């Protein structure tokens, strides 16, 4: 079993420190800053609007583990 390039990248990437406004390429919206404006613990609580989250749907499509399909089948094997 061999991990995908995206999975390898995910495994090795670093967490963003919270909501960030200025790191996205053209055509990609940031998370709504107003929802985090009122947040007090910004290093622990990260508000993401649904529209922002939906941007990932057709972007990260890879399995979250190399044998995910095999793990699922055996878990609900019946």
């Amino acid at each position: 079993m061999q991990p995908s390039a995206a999975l390898q990248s995910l495994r090795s990437a670093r967490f963003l420190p919270g909501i960030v406004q200025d790191i996205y390429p053209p055509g990609i919206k940031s998370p709504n800053p107003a929802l985090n404006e009122a947040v007090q613990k910004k290093g622990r609580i990260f508000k993401y609007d649904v529209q922002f989250l939906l941007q990932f749907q057709n972007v990260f499509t890879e399995k979250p583990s190399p044998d995910f399909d095999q793990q699922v089948k055996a878990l609900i094997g019946d």
Binding site: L10, A13, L16, I23, L53, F56, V59, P64
Partner: protein, 191 residues
């Protein structure tokens, strides 16, 4: 510096944290053999990023493909999606039942429910009430719920959660979302 998944979906170096770790659970239907009706709840995967969520979601059956008597549950890490868990024992749920009709895009509704949960737009930062969300596939209907830790820590905090779920589900005003305690005791609030 930071390449997101949107800069290069095969070579990126930052990911989007969730405010806690979440675990996806699945309830299978009883086996047609008849020797497993008491061990149906399965722990699928625990995750901690927005990207990981979508890797899971894109590789699992949509609700509309599940058999009757199946459920998905998305709960904060450490909380089992059962009434006996210490964090649900004195709690309850806000729930709504949908008809199984095609103009009801149940997959989208469930998806948006999970996104509201993990994106922390169901409750405010100190509320401490949301434990998870659940979709139930039944014969007559689908049910979508938000499970809560208490039934009484703060009524206003609970009502606001119910109103947000109603908004997430895009329900019109006649359609009511209802709160109920898991136990008869913790039951003995509609929006």
């Amino acid at each position: 510096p930071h390449m997101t998944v949107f800069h290069d979906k095969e070579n990126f170096n930052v990911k989007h944290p969730l405010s806690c770790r979440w675990t996806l659970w699945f309830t299978k239907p009883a086996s047609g053999k008849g020797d497993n009706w008491n061990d149906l709840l399965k722990k699928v995967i625990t995750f901690e990023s927005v990207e990981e969520f979508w890797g899971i979601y894109n590789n699992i059956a949509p609700v509309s493909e599940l058999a009757v008597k199946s459920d998905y549950h998305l709960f904060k890490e450490g909380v089992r999606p059962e009434w006996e868990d210490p964090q649900n024992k004195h709690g309850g749920k806000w729930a709504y039942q949908f008809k199984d009709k095609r103009s009801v895009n149940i997959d989208e509704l469930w998806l948006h429910t999970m996104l509201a949960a993990i994106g922390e737009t169901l409750e405010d930062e100190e509320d401490g009430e949301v434990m998870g969300v659940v979709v139930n596939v039944r014969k007559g209907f689908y049910r979508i719920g938000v499970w809560t830790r208490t039934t009484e820590k703060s009524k206003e905090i609970l009502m606001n959660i119910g109103r947000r779920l109603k908004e997430v589900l895009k329900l019109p005003p006649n359609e009511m979302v209802e709160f109920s305690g898991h136990t008869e005791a913790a039951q003995a609030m509609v929006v």
